[PDB]
């Protein structure tokens, strides 16, 4: 006899944003009261008819909510307490930084560290994958050499864990607010899609990434570089899918990856490394 | 004689009504033997037939690991399908998955299966060669291209020709006295007037296992397939099944009608008639 409470679109919400609480009970988005003490309601027992729309979101909206749905033909007139939903209101100051160790390219099945860190001494850090409904994971901030930091473990890596993450610092005066979000960090999984071939292919020598698999896009990366180049895959007459990456090119060790359009966080296994000379 | 193992996954989005839910059940023939429900208090692969309980902790660990992984995968596939079909994040949608193997009486693989559906309609299916896909629409053609690149068919074939058959053989021995012993139907014919000029003859088959059965009415020897009402075979609740077939007959012509039953547990086909 427990309603289902939910926040939409996200329980992690910025000041000035919008969030809606609904309390689904007896196969309806019923009338409900909200609680934050589950034996005494908030707002002087205000009975929300269909949905509590908090808009614009303020810090006063942060908190840990439960609802009870209206049950007129019942001994107590109401339901048991619902699942709790924590509205976490994110802030506008003191943004931490987020970085992946060893890096943001994560082999399928392996783990990666998402390190949240700051010069600000945060008591706790939080990690939130953009667009998921779970509570942000929390870790104690560890102090060492004028930085506070926490190591979030993500894995074993698969496509549902890839994509954009944010981290946040705690707020001293409430457990339900967060710092401003870190800049985003995109995690990309490599595999299990088959690795392409990478090779030097009136002719001009190029680095060609190729496969019989119908990748939409190829990504070329150099060890010890930072900028990944990308090119659309071209259908060749041999039934192969290939991209030809062009005195300005750095020598060194290169790898390439295939990917599919609109799935930008899932790459193939890497090609074998290719040494490029001169 | 022949046997099958099947797993059935249902992944449901229910925005505002619950968390995305993943449920899975496993069958040997018509006998359900395991379940997983992401909504359960303690989500884990759990026994639903007594003979699966002879598997040890390592088995249940690995089955639970598989189910949690698939739940994570299919929750995200629901989100991907929304964008393929330009559907609203407010609606409720369902992915269903089936796979398994069929073996003949000698235990040799006869065919493998792996099929997928979105909102109750075919999406993509592994072909009988266990090496190629049939995609039902342009969205599933994207999925097909990804699964070709990831060599998914090779992994399905490896399972269907190996561990699927090996485990099915194992279960058949562990539950032999219920899985490999046919329970023949108990049969009788009932009569009920519909007026002073017509009546219903109803042929019953009760307590049989497995569920496959043929139940027909003949009149003077010819089958009344056009005038026969057949109910869907239904579970008794005790791992057996029930079915009936009825024909509407003119007053006084009951002796012309015979009910016919064939079932694995019946060494010869059966003929029944009604007598007051």
């Amino acid at each position: 006899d427990k309603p289902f409470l939910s926040a939409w679109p996200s329980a992690v919400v910025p000041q000035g944003g919008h969030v809606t609480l609904r309390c689904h009970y007896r196969h309806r988005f019923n009338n409900f009261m909200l609680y934050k003490r589950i034996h005494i309601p908030i707002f002087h027992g205000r009975i929300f008819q269909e949905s509590f729309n908090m808009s614009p979101v303020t810090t006063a909206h942060a908190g840990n909510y439960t609802c009870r749905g209206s049950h007129p033909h019942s001994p107590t007139g109401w339901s048991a307490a619902s699942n709790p939903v924590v509205i976490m209101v994110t802030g506008n100051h003191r943004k931490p930084s987020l970085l992946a160790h060893p890096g943001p390219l994560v082999k399928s099945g392996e783990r990666v560290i998402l390190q949240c860190w700051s010069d600000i001494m945060f008591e706790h850090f939080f990690l939130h994958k953009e667009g998921i409904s779970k509570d942000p994971s929390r870790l104690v901030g560890q102090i060492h050499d004028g930085v506070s930091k926490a190591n979030f473990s993500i894995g074993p890596m698969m496509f549902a864990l890839a994509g954009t993450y944010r981290c946040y610092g705690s707020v001293t005066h409430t457990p339900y607010q967060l710092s401003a979000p870190s800049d985003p960090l995109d995690i990309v999984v490599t595999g299990p899609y088959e690795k392409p071939s990478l090779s030097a292919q009136g002719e001009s020598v190029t680095l060609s990434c190729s496969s019989r698999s119908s990748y939409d896009m190829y990504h070329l990366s150099r060890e010890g570089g930072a900028h990944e180049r990308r090119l659309p895959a071209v259908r060749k007459v041999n039934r192969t899918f290939q991209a030809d990456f062009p005195p300005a090119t750095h020598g060194g060790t290169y790898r390439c990856f295939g990917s599919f359009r609109h799935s930008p966080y899932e790459w193939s296994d890497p090609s074998d490394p290719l040494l490029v000379s001169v | 004689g022949s046997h099958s193992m099947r797993y059935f996954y249902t992944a449901m989005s229910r925005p505002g009504r619950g968390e995305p839910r993943f449920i899975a059940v496993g069958y040997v023939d018509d006998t359900q033997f395991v379940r997983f429900d992401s909504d359960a208090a303690s989500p884990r692969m759990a026994p639903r037939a007594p003979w699966i309980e002879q598997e040890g902790p390592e088995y249940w660990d690995g089955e639970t690991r598989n189910m949690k992984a698939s739940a994570q995968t299919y929750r995200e596939n629901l989100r991907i399908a929304l964008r393929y079909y330009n559907q609203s994040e407010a609606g409720s949608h369902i992915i269903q998955v089936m796979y398994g193997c069929d073996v003949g009486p000698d235990g040799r693989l006869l065919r493998g299966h792996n099929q997928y559906a979105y909102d109750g309609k075919d999406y993509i299916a592994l072909n009988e060669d266990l090496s190629s896909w049939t995609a039902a629409d342009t969205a599933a053609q994207i999925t097909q291209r990804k699964w070709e690149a990831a060599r998914v068919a090779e992994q399905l074939r490896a399972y269907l020709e190996g561990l699927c058959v090996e485990w099915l053989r194992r279960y058949l021995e562990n539950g032999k006295e219920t899985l490999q012993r046919a329970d023949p139907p108990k049969t009788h014919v009932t009569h009920h007037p519909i007026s002073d000029h017509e009546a219903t003859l109803r042929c019953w088959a009760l307590g049989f296992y497995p569920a496959e059965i043929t139940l027909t009415w003949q009149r003077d020897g010819e089958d009344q397939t056009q005038d026969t009402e057949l109910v869907e075979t239904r579970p008794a609740g005790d791992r057996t099944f029930q079915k009936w077939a009825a024909v509407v007959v003119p007053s006084g012509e009951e002796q012309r009608y015979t009910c016919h039953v064939q079932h694995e547990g019946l060494p010869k086909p059966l003929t029944l008639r009604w007598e007051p």
Binding site: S108, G109, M158, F159, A160, P192, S263, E266 | Y7, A24, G26, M45, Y59, G62, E63, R65, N66, M67, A69, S70, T73, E76, N77, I80, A81, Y84, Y99, I142, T143, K146, W147, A150, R151, V152, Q155, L156, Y159, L163, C164, W167
Partner: peptide, 10 residues
Amino acid sequence: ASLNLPAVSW
């Protein structure tokens, strides 16, 4: 026993 599905997306 179930198949540990290839962790692939639709």
